Write a protein that binds this DNA or RNA. Structure first.
Ligand code: ZN
Lengths: 57, 50, 101, 158, 184
RNA sequence: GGUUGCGGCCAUAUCUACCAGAAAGCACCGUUUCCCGUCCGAUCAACUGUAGUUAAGCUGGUAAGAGCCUGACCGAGUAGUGUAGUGGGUGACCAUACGCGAAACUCAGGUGCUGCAAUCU
RNA sequence: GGCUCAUGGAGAACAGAAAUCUCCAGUAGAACAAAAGGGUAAAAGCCCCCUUGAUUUUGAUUUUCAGUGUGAAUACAAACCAUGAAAGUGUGGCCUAUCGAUCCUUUAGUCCCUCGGAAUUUGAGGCUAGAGGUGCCAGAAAAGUUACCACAGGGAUAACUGGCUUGUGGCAGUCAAGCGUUCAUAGCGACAUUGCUUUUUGAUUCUUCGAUGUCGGCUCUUCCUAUCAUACCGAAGCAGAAUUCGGUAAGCGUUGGAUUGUUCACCCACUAAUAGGGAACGUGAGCUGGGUUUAGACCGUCGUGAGACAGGUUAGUUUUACCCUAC
RNA sequence: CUAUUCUCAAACUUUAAAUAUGUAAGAAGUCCUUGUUACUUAAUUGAACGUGGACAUUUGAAUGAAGAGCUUUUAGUGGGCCAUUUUUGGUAAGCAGAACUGGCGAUGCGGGAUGAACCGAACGUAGAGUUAAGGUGCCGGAAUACACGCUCAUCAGACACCA
RNA sequence: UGACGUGCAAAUCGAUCGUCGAAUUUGGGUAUAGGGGCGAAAGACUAAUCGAACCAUCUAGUAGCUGGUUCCUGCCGAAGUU
RNA sequence: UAUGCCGCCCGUCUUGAAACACGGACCAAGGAGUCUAACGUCUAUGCGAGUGUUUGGGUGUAAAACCCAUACGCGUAAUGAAAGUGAACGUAGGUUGGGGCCUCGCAAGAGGUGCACAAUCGACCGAUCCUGAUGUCUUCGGAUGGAUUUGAGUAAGAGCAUA
C-alpha cells in the first residue's frame, strides 16, 4: 500500500550543508590505548616536567 | 506529545481549576480595610496598645 | 547438557581470591514470603471491588529456561552463580563419557 | 526474512586466493608496526580472530595503539552527512604497510638531499612536481621511414 | 548563474548593539571613528566587544585582573574590560592599576580605588590611549554560564539533564546505571 | 663452487620418467644395558661411529614432457564499459563522438633465487 | 602430543559387494552437531594424556546504529588458573544465527547502609551481579456476531463504467509434414511461428465513496463490418440443381413462438435470411421491477450460540423538469 | 578409463574490466645531538613525549575558494511521483519494487498544436543587441532558399519522448 | 406495484378487495415509565422519535479523522528518507 | 470602446484539478493560534556573589505613587541508595594552538607576555574496588598509597529579578 525504502535525495540532503572531516587535533585521543603504556607514559611526562623545572635556573 | 529537549514539568491542571482561580485584586482594598480596622480598634481600646 | 559436579574455579572469598574446588548444584528460587513490599502493595490494591488491578501474563513463548549453577567453595563456604545457555534436559552430573566406543 | 549478519555478503572477499591457501608466511609477523604508521585493512579468512568487518576490508587508516598480537587503527567512517573516528582492534595478519606513505617518506629525503646540495652550488632545483606537460617541438625524420599509406578494409565474414 | 554559495546571506555578525542605550551609542560612535582612522588592531577588538551581548560580555573579576598583572612584563599595563568588572572577596592583595570597564560594581570600585588604582571608562581610556598603547584586553569565561552544561546532551556526553528537581526519583533509574536496564 | 643447520620469498622451486654424483657433509646403515615407546627398537627412545653402503634418500642434469612463471604490435584496440545526441531502428538492438580497455587463443623465453653460521679436496 | 582423511588400485582361510589384515596412489574429491558460505593437511580434521579461560574485576572497541538499547563479537589491562620441554595458546564451541527492558518475585555478594526519640534480635527495605519474560521478539492483560445497525473518514482501498495491458477469449496471416483415388494448398492442415481486436475473462487501482441509480427485458435511433440474405462478380474435387471458398459491398433487411428473470442456452415454425457487434457492458427525471442486494419469514448444511451460506424458497415504496442546451 | 567434440550457469570459476571507492602528497614536516620512565630490553636496546640546534625564494602536484571554523534554538516534512541508464517480479501494464543521477512536487518563460515530468533555458522593472531549443507555403514572425538523389500510393508521407 | 409524490395529506385519494355477532368494534375511567413497560412475537409499539423515549445537565465530552483559518512587501527556502 | 495576440474558476486535499473531485446564488455585518500556571533557547534592563520592595508593614494628592524590617526562593558545592564525606604538590599545573598588548627594528619580521575558547596530559572532591600506619572500649580507628572504574564535580565565582 505504501513504499518501503529509497536512498533518493539522501546524497543531495547530505552534501547540501554537510559532508565534513573530523578536524584532526594535535595530541590525539589517548583513550583505549594500552593501559600499561599509559600508566608508564604519565611517569615519563612527569619526569620530563621535573627535569625542565630543574633546568629553569 | 513529548519535548524536543525540555525539562519534564508537573503542571497540576487536569481538574476544573478554572472554577476556583482566586485573583487578589482585593489586596489594596483589604490593606486600607486592615488599617481602618486597626485605627478603629485603637479608638475602642483607647489608651492601650493593640 | 551434563555439568559434572565439584570443579576448581575462582573464588571471590576475601580469603581465597584463587582457584578452589566449589561443589556445584542447580539454582531454584524460594517463596514469595507473603511480606515482600511488592506483595503487600499487590494484596492492598487487589482487595475490594475492581477485580484484577494488575496484569496476568498468559503468552508463554519460550519452551525451556536458562539453567543456573550454584557453585559453593568448600573452604570458606561462599557461593557464586554461573548461567549456562538454554538447554532442554539438565544432568547435575553425570555418566561421562565415553570418548569413543 | 533479511540477513544482516557480521560476515554476511562476504563469500568472495574473505575467500583465501587461488593456490595461496594454508599457512601465513612469517614476514607478516616479523614486520614492525609503530604509532602514526599508515596501514591497510585486508582480512585473512584463514585467521578468524581480530578480523575486520567487510566495510573496513580495503580501507587504509593509521595505527593509534600497539599491543601483543594486534594493533589499533583509526578509519574515517562517513554515516549520512559526516565522518566519525572508528577505532578498530586488528590482529596483525589482517593489515599491511602502505607503499603510498613509503614513496612519500623517501621523496621527503630526496627533496632534503636536492635542496641541501643545491644551496651551495649553481641552483635550478624546482622542488615541486609538475603534471604531464604538452610535448615540446621535435623533428620526425623519414630516413628509411617513408610513411606506409594505410587504407580502410572491405567487409568479409570470419 | 549556478550559485556556489547562499545569495544575499548576511555577514552573521553584529554591526551595531541591539542595546538602544544612548551612552553606549556615543561610546560606539567614538570607537567606530578611532577604529576607522587609527589603524591600530586594538580599536577593532573594542568596537566588536561593545556590540557583544550580555551572554558574551561576562563579568571579569578583580581576582582575574590581579592574575593577568601577575604576568611578567605586563605588570604596568591598563586593564581593558569590555563589560562588568565584579568584586572577588577571595583575594586580599591587590596592586595599583588602571582598568577601563563599561561598568564597575560598588565592591569592585571600592577595592580598585583602595589599592590606589584608577577606574576608567572607554572614552577616558581613548583620550590617553588612542591606539590602546600599553593595554591588556581581558574576557570573562563564556563556557561557565549554567545553560552551557545542557548543550549537546546525549549518550554518552556527560552533559547536564534539563530538570527542575535534582534528588533520587528524578532521572537516575533506567539508563543511568547497569543495574536498571543499561547506563547512558 | 659442494654440503650441512636455520631460513626469506613459497612450483622459474611441484609432477613424470630416466641418468650421474670426487671430497666432505647428509643419509641409509649397526646394537638393545640404560632413559623411553610400541602388538612389533618397524616409527619414537638410548648406545656406537664401530660391522657395510651410494642402491634409496638428497643434490644435479636430461625430455620438440605435464604443470607453473614471464613477455609480445599475438589475438585486440576486439569483447566490455563511462560519457553524448530531437543519432538510426516497429522493436530486438545497433552505428558514430569523446575516453578507459580485458579474458581466451597464438608465438618466444624460462625452470628457483637469496640471507646468516659452520664445514669441505 | 601422534597420525592423515574421501575414493581408488593390487593382494591374505572360512570371507562373498560388503567382517578383519597389508602395501601403493591419494590438495582434500573427507571431517569439523546443525542451514549455507568461508576456513583448515606434521591441522581447526581423527586417536591419545591433563584440565575447567564455559573463571574474577570492571572499562574501551566493532556490527546493527539515533552512533540509544539488546544480542553477538574484538582487543587489551589487573587477578587467579589450565596445559606444554617451552615458545606460546586459552575470558566457551574455527567464523558468520541460536535470543529479551522497567515494575514484581527469587538468588549470589558484603564483619556494608536504612527502618528518622535511643538500643538489641527476628522482620522489611536498600547497594553491586544473576535468574523467573514478554516469539506481536524496544516487551497491552483480552472471544464472537450484526442481513436491525451506527459515527468520523477514505477514491490512500474493493463491488459498475472508462483508461494502459492482452495472459485468457475472439478473429487473421506466414511455413507446409500431411488429409483429400492420384494430387500440399478445390476445401482443410501437424510441428512451429507473426499478428490484429477490445463484443469475454483476468491483471492493475489512474477517475469517482459531501453517490455517475448496480441485471434482463420492452421501446427507439445511429454507427462498426470480422457479410447470414440480397446486387454484380471470381474459384472448385462447379454437368444440372445444390453447396462450399473468396471479392467489391453495410444500400437493403435479418422474424413468430414453448421453458428460463436471466444475458447465455435449447427446441418448434416460417422466411431470402432468421450474421456478429458498439454507442457509460446505449437506453430507470423513458417504462417495467421478474432477478440482484435492506428490514418479515421457511428449509437444508455449518456454528454450543448469536448467527453464516456467490445454497433453495415466498412477501417486499422505482421521487422531481417549470431551468440551459439538444431535438 | 584415454584423447577429441557441440553448447551453458542469479545462488560455478583460473583469469578479470570500465564507472564508482580508501589513503598520502609535509612546520602537528624532515635531519642531527641529547633529557625522564615505575613500560619494554641481555644491554648503555627500544617505545612515547620532549630539550637544544639546523633547513622557509621551490611552504614540497593541478584548479578553485564565493570568507573559514563553531554553537544554540526552532518551523515544516516523514502519502511522493516522473525520465535516460543498470535492474527484480510479471505475458504485460499509464503495473509492482530497487540503484545512480537529473527533474515535477514547490516552476513561471521559448519550443514539442494541446500536455506537471520531454527539449532550451530558470524569472526584479524597462530599453537595445544576440541566440537557445524549434522552425521560415498560408494560418504564423522567418528563403514558395540553394544543391545532389529517392518516392506516385483507388488507405501515400510528413520530426525524438508520443500516441 | 392506479392517482398524488416541491400532494388534500410528513401516508391521503379512487377502484378492487379481507372480514362483518364475535379471540368483534369502540367512548370514558383506571393500571403498567425507559435497560423500564407492553408485545396472539414484526425488535413491534411506548406523543410523526425506538436494536433502548423525551427534557435538562456533566458539556465547549473526545477525534491519529473532514472542513476553515482574515493586510502588503523584502530576504532565505525544505520534506516525503533513517 | 474597437483591434492583434494572450488569458480555463477560485479556495482545498492531492504524485497529479479547468476537471465528469469537494465548498461557493448574491450582499452587509459577525467569524478562527487566545489568556493562564510552570518552563527551554535567544535578546534587552537593572544590580552583580549576590539577587528579588508590592505575602506583609509604613505612607498617600488613595486600587496609583513613595518608603521598609525579618524571612523566604534561587544562586554561592558536589557526590552517594544511604549512614556519609566534601574541592591548591606547582605561578591554581604542563603541552600545542590563540586575538590583543610589550620589545628590537623603516618595513618584512623575529622575540616576549598570552585573556576567551579548543585539544590534550595531569592534580583536587564524592562514589566503587582494594592497600591497611600510629593507635585501641580487641574491634573500633582508616593514616598512607594505588585502580583500562565512576559523577549532571573543583581548578581567581555568574547569577538573581523583570520584559
Ligand atoms: Zn573460597
Amino acid at each position: 500500500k505504501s513504499k518501503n525504502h529509497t536512498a533518493h535525495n539522501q546524497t543531495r540532503k547530505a552534501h547540501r550543508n554537510g559532508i565534513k572531516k573530523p578536524k584532526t587535533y594535535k595530541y590525539p585521543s589517548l583513550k583505549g590505548v594500552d593501559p600499561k603504556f599509559r600508566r608508564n607514559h604519565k611517569h615519563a611526562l612527569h619526569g620530563t616536567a621535573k627535569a625542565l623545572a630543574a633546568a629553569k635556573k | 506529545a513529548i519535548s524536543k529537549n525540555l525539562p519534564i514539568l508537573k503542571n497540576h491542571f487536569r481538574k476544573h481549576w478554572q472554577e476556583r482561580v482566586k485573583v487578589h485584586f482585593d489586596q489594596a482594598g483589604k490593606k486600607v480595610s486592615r488599617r481602618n480596622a486597626r485605627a478603629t480598634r485603637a479608638a475602642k481600646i483607647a489608651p492601650r496598645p493593640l | 547438557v551434563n555439568v559434572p559436579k565439584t570443579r576448581k574455579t575462582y573464588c571471590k572469598g576475601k580469603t581465597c581470591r584463587k582457584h578452589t574446588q566449589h561443589k556445584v548444584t542447580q539454582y531454584k528460587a524460594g517463596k514469595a514470603s507473603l511480606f515482600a513490599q511488592g506483595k503487600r502493595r499487590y494484596d492492598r490494591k487487589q482487595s475490594g471491588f475492581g477485580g484484577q488491578t494488575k496484569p496476568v501474563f498468559h503468552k508463554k513463548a519460550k519452551t525451556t529456561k536458562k539453567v543456573v549453577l550454584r557453585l559453593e567453595c568448600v573452604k570458606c563456604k561462599t557461593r557464586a552463580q554461573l548461567t549456562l545457555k538454554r538447554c532442554k534436559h539438565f544432568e547435575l552430573g553425570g555418566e561421562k563419557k565415553q570418548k569413543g566406543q | 526474512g533479511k540477513s544482516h549478519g557480521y560476515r554476511s555478503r562476504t563469500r568472495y572477499m574473505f575467500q583465501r586466493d587461488f593456490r595461496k591457501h594454508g599457512a601465513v608466511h612469517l614476514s607478516t609477523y616479523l614486520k614492525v608496526y609503530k604509532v602514526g604508521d599508515i596501514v591497510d585493512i585486508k582480512a585473512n579468512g584463514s585467521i578468524q580472530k581480530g578480523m575486520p568487518h567487510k566495510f573496513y576490508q580495503g580501507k587504509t587508516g593509521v595505527v593509534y595503539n600497539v599491543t601483543k598480537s594486534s594493533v589499533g587503527v583509526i578509519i574515517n567512517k562517513m554515516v549520512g552527512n559526516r565522518y566519525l573516528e572508528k577505532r578498530l582492534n586488528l590482529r596483525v595478519e589482517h593489515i599491511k604497510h602502505s607503499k603510498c606513505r613509503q614513496e612519500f617518506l623517501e621523496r621527503v629525503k630526496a627533496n632534503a638531499a636536492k635542496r641541501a646540495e643545491a644551496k651551495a652550488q649553481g641552483v635550478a632545483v624546482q622542488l615541486k612536481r609538475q603534471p604531464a606537460q604538452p610535448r615540446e617541438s621535435r623533428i620526425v625524420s623519414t630516413e628509411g621511414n617513408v610513411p606506409q599509406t594505410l587504407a580502410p578494409v572491405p567487409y568479409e565474414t570470419f | 548563474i549556478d550559485h556556489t554559495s547562499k545569495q544575499h546571506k548576511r555577514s552573521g555578525h553584529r554591526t551595531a548593539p541591539k542595546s538602544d542605550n544612548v551612552y553606549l551609542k556615543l561610546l560606539v560612535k567614538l570607537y567606530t571613528f578611532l577604529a576607522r582612522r587609527t589603524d591600530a588592531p586594538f580599536n577593532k577588538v573594542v568596537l566588536k566587544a561593545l556590540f557583544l551581548s550580555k551572554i558574551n560580555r561576562p563579568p571579569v573579576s578583580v581576582s582575574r585582573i590581579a592574575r593577568a598583572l601577575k604576568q611578567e612584563g605586563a605588570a604596568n599595563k591598563t586593564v581593558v574590560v569590555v563589560g562588568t568588572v565584579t568584586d572577588d572577596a577571595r583575594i586580599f592583595e591587590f596592586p595599583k592599576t588602571t582598568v577601563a570597564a563599561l561598568r564597575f560594581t560598588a565592591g569592585a570600585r571600592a577595592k580598585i580605588v583602595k589599592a590606589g588604582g584608577e577606574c576608567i571608562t572607554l572614552d577616558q581610556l581613548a583620550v590617553r590611549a588612542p591606539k590602546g598603547q600599553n593595554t591588556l584586553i581581558l574576557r570573562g569565561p563564556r563556557n561557565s554560564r549554567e545553560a552551557v552544561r545542557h548543550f549537546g546532551m546525549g549518550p554518552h556526553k556527560g552533559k547536564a539533564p534539563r530538570i527542575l528537581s535534582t534528588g533520587r526519583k528524578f532521572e537516575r533509574a533506567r539508563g543511568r546505571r547497569r543495574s536498571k536496564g543499561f547506563k547512558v
